[PDB]
Paper text:
[name], which is mutated in juvenile-onset Parkinson’s disease and autosomal recessive spastic paraplegia 78, is a transporter with a critical role in balancing the polyamine concentration between the lysosome and the cytosol. The overall structure of hATP13A2 has a canonical P-type ATPase architecture, with the cytosolic A domain linking to TM1 and TM2 domains, and the N and P domains sitting on the TM4 and TM5. The P-type ATPases transport substrates by coupling ATP hydrolysis with protein phosphorylation states and adopting a series of intermediate states, consisting of E1, E1-ATP, E1P-ADP, E1P, E2P, E2-Pi, and E2, in a process known as the Post-Albers reaction. Here, we report seven cryo-EM structures of hATP13A2 in six intermediate states, importantly including the putative E2 and E1-like states, thereby providing a nearly complete atomic-level conformational cycle spanning the Post-Albers reaction process.
Numbering used by the authors: 36 to 108, 161 to 496, 498 to 587, 609 to 697, 709 to 791, 815 to 1169
The structure:
């Protein structure tokens, strides 16, 4: 994706700069297919010398944007585009990327010796980067009102208002204007909510202390802060303005609310005198913006200080919020499938309108008044209540998230309508965060004998000191806190650390034990190292702990027991986790991981949540494949699978040995060809090579893949990208820090143990359970059908309104003004709002929701309903001949004053019943929501509607003048009315109960259809070929 930067600097004398004022309004045209003359809009072709107007040809892009002057105050031009910053380059033409050729590399000599910049005209530094603040642009209320009024639907509504005012019917104009006003207010509220909810994330500026060269200390606002400037921690407590790199010493930082898991991770200063450092090593020795600081070691005299390196929208914090405003990537699904339906509706409306206008023109009716009546008839195509009512269902559904989970920020909620896959993480979702001590086995005194494994503090020796000082706990005037596994290890020995006054243990029988250096437990290396020294020791002793798989390789080959595989896999069958320890007396950074020697093994317990099995079993009944991603040891998921019954009938995996270039990887039977009928398990090391090697096997192997072992976090993004390329919609659950990498844009997922008002991802709930997945699934699926229901209701209402208006026009009689309102005010908006109040159904959907509209069955059902409605109930023209009445005074005035007309009264009375019965029947449905009576507001609304409607058919009382109703000659004439209305009532249910049946599919059970969709062909080939 690239494009040129051509433009015309001024090319304006004009003198024609004013002739275009009266020209046609062209902005709307340029938004779609700008080839119609976008260049004519003050965009002549010219060179790239000082271009005031910068535009991109979008040769390989489907969108374009324009940015303009001015630059502040050699002088280098700059502009702001989507939050990115660029600066002019003198040596070359055009602009260049920000950070002045740094790209993470710079002269470390002067940079390390940060003596403080001596005010070298800081204005230049400010121009390139700008103020060190983040402020998402916010538009004023009039700005948001005016810029949202260009929608063509609103223009059509305004034209309808103007026409209704012109035709001497201002009452309808008032109702249309009120509808437009409510639409405007609800749109303004929707636009506000997101902005005013995401605005709180913008941390306010605060006073900070910054040091100057020569020993001068001054307090300045955080705005003045610039990258590469001095920055001193505030009294070892507070908040950080932006990211920075520690100059020296050790510091403690947390990223609970910004990255995920709240467990503190130790931080150490970056190596000195090495060279340029890229972003890969930043995480090891980089800070984060808006993070609390616990304590820092004051190894050197002067207090701890840091230097900022990143600022503005290019910071790590800014990247996550960059997705806000401009969507990236664009919406997965585009609703371009209703073209056939809208074309059919338009052609039907045109046919009806031409028939009606011809009928009206007949009978020697004046031609002058035909045009206005035809316009009124055709205005029924798009009532003003459509946009307002269609856009409120999502907002009403969003109210559920406030009460019940998940706690999300809005439009992307519909991406889960047609999901067919789900993923889970075993790190903390399927097991409790805390670990239970089970036992430990030493490897001293006996060369290789197993001895007796049990957790006891009685034995003493190097193992005691290794376990005592192997952790990353943090303390603040209370008991130590940190990773649950570390505190579980340390509590076994019972030793405590309290106030060197911070690197010395307590209650040491043999000799006090101290520590020299401490490192975190980053999952990248899945291991940690520590140096342990005690007084009187000949030399310091180093200790390293980590996964048993890799410790053996780096250790002395002739130290491990011959049957170490049996020892390590004995506890695997029980579902427990095992770790290995090592030590070596290294005499006086990567050098400390040399020929180490293992010292022992430790086994922990990972209890499974009792509530995982039933929810998973219930979710397994929807015929959706489930996969797991984790970097644990070989197998160890058999117990979990048995608990949730995924591989209960059969299970198999793939060999791990793939070192040889031949990569001969035959299948394994766990507990011959490879039909892959059973469930296959992959491995991290194998997945890292099989993806690029033998690509033809990837499509037919990824489908059967269920679990992964010893896989690095870097493969998650690749895995999700591959699944997306395979046209697979899947979700995953995150519970740690190395889980949000794949949540950026590929594709969706869930999180666990997250704080409120999360902005990193549109998740999650507050409960620390995987029970939210059924909740989000069911709420989403019940939300999908709301759009279909409202579309059906709107279409049927439009069809009946059109048929009524065109049939009524058989003669000069015309309906008044308040008659239209009596329906448009309490039959359209009320029910539209009420239907949005539905809720999810307790029973999980057995089948996936309908694919999409339009479809043959729904068209057949709706056309059948329309023909039935337009059928027998039109007997008001024929059956009336059997009762006394007088013919209307046709032609008498051709005005709506014909109050005593008989046909108008009956049609108006039955129109409300038709509308309400259609609304009730269209919303009927057993799955995806509870029955209609579950909603109390809807019951009261329909009850009062029926109570007030039935009063009109009953002998009218006093105060009936404004309604223009007329008395009935015979009180018994209502027998036909009640009979026909009850017949329609029963028929609606009778037809709805049979049309929902599979008859549309029953008539084509001998289907020759063969739909692949890139999902069925693979499995068909797999089952056909062994």
């Amino acid at each position: 994706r690239l494009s040129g930067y051509c433009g015309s600097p001024w090319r304006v004398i004009g003198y024609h700069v004013v002739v275009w004022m009266m020209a046609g309004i062209p902005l709307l045209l340029f938004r779609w297919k700008p080839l119609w003359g976008v260049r004519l809009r003050l965009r002549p072709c010219n060179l790239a010398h000082a271009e005031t107007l910068v535009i991109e040809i979008r040769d390989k892009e489907d969108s374009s944007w324009q940015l303009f002057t001015v630059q502040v105050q050699r002088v280098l031009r700059y502009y702001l585009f989507q939050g990115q910053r660029y600066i002019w380059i003198e040596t070359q033409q055009a602009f260049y990327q920000v950070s002045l050729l740094d790209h993470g590399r710079s002269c470390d000599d002067v940079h390390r010796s940060r003596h403080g910049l001596s005010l070298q005209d800081q204005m230049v530094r400010k121009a390139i980067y700008g103020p060190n603040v983040i402020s998402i642009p916010v538009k004023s209320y009039p700005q948001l009102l005016v810029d949202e009024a260009l929608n063509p639907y609103y223009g059509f509504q305004a034209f309808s208002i103007a026409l209704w005012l012109a035709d001497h019917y201002y009452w309808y104009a008032l109702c249309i204007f009120l509808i437009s006003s409510i639409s405007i207010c609800l749109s303004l509220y929707k636009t506000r909510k997101q902005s005013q909810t995401l605005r709180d994330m913008v941390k306010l500026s605060m006073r900070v202390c910054v040091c100057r060269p020569g020993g001068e200390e001054e307090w300045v606002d955080s705005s003045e802060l610039v990258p590469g400037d001095c920055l001193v921690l505030p009294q070892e407590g507070g908040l950080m303005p932006c990211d920075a790199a520690l100059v020296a010493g050790e510091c403690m930082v947390n990223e609970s609310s910004l990255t995920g898991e709240s467990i503190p991770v130790l931080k150490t200063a970056l190596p000195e005198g090495l060279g340029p450092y890229c972003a890969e090593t930043h995480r090891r020795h980089t800070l984060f913006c808006g993070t609390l600081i616990l304590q820092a070691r004051a190894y050197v005299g002067p207090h701890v200080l840091a230097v900022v390196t990143r600022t503005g929208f290019c910071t790590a914090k800014g990247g996550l919020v960059s997705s806000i405003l401009h969507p990236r990537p664009i919406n997965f699904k585009f609703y371009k499938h209703s073209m056939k339906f809208v074309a059919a509706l338009s052609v039907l409306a045109l046919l009806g309108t031409i028939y009606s206008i011809f009928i009206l023109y007949r009978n020697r009716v004046p031609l002058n008044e035909i045009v206005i009546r035809a316009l009124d008839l055709v205005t029924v195509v798009v009532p003003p209540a459509l946009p307002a009512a269609m856009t409120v269902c999502t907002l009403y559904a969003q109210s559920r998230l406030r009460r019940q989970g998940i706690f999300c920020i809005p439009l992307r909620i519909n991406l889960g309508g047609k999901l067919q896959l789900v993923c889970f993480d075993k790190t903390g979702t399927l097991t409790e965060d805390g670990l239970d001590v089970m036992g430990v086995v030493p490897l001293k005194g006996q060369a290789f004998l197993p001895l007796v494994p049990e957790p006891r503090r009685l034995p003493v020796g190097p193992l005691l000191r290794a376990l005592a000082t192997c952790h990353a706990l943090s303390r603040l005037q209370d008991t130590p806190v940190g990773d649950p596994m570390d505190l579980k290890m340390v509590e076994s020995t019972g030793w405590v650390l309290e106030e060197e006054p911070q690197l010395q243990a307590m209650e040491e029988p043999p000799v006090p034990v101290s520590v020299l250096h401490r490192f975190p437990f980053s999952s990248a290396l899945q291991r940690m190292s520590v140096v342990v020294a005690w007084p009187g020791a000949t030399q310091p002793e180093a200790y390293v702990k980590g996964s048993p798989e890799l410790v053996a390789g780096l250790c002395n080959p002739e130290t491990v027991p011959t049957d170490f595989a049996q020892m390590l896999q004995s506890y695997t069958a029980a579902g427990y986790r095992v770790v290995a320890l090592a030590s070596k007396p290294l005499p006086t950074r990567d050098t400390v991981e040399g020929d180490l020697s293992l010292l022992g093994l430790l086994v922990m317990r990972n209890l499974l949540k009792p509530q995982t099995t039933p929810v998973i079993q219930a979710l397994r009944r929807t015929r959706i494949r489930a996969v797991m991603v984790t970097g644990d040891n070989l197998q160890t998921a058999v117990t979990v699978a048995r608990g949730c019954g995924m591989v209960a009938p059969q299970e198999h995996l793939i060999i791990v040995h793939a070192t040889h270039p031949e990569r001969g990887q035959p299948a394994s039977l766990e507990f011959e060809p490879d039909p892959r009928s059973r469930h296959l398990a992959l491995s991290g090391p194998t997945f890292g090579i099989i993806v690029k090697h033998f690509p033809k096997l990837l499509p037919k192997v990824l489908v059967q893949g269920t679990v992964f072992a010893r896989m690095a976090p870097e493969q998650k993004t690749e895995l999700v990208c591959e699944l997306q390329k395979l046209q697979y919609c899947v979700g995953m659950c995150g519970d740690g820090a190395n889980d949000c990498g794949a949540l950026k844009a590929a594709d969706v997922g869930i999180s666990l143990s997250q704080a409120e008002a999360s902005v990193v991802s549109p998740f999650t709930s507050s409960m620390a359970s995987i029970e939210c997945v059924p909740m989000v699934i069911r709420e989403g699926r019940c939300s999908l059908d709301t759009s279909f229901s409202v579309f059906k209701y709107m279409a049927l209402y439009s069809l009946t309104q059109f048929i009524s208006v065109l049939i009524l026009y058989t003669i000069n009689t015309n309906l008044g003004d308040l008659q239209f309102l009596a329906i448009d005010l309490v039959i359209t908006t009320t029910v539209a709002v009420l239907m949005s109040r539905t809720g999810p159904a307790l029973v999980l959907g057995r089948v996936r929701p309908p694919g999409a509209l339009l479809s043959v069955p729904v068209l057949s059902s709706l056309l059948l309903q329309m023909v039935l409605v337009t059928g027998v109930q039109l007997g008001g023209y024929f059956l009336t001949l059997a009762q006394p009445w007088f013919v209307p005074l046709n032609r008498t005035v051709a005005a709506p004053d014909n109050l005593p007309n008989y046909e108008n009264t009956v049609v108006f009375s039955l129109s409300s019943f038709q509308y309400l019965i259609l609304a009730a029947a269209v919303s009927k449905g057993a799955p995806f929501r509870r029955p209609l009576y579950t909603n109390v507001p809807f019951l009261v609304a329909l009850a009062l509607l029926s109570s007030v409607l039935v009063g009109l058919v009953l002998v009218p009382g006093l105060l009936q003048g404004p309604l223009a109703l007329r008395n009935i000659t015979d009180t018994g004439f209502k027998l036909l009315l009640l009979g026909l209305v009850t017949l329609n009532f029963v028929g609606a249910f009778m037809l709805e109960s049979v049309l929902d049946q599979c008859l549309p599919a029953c008539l084509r059970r001998l289907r020759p259809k063969r739909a692949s969709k890139k999902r069925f062909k693979q499995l068909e080939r797999e089952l056909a070929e062994q």
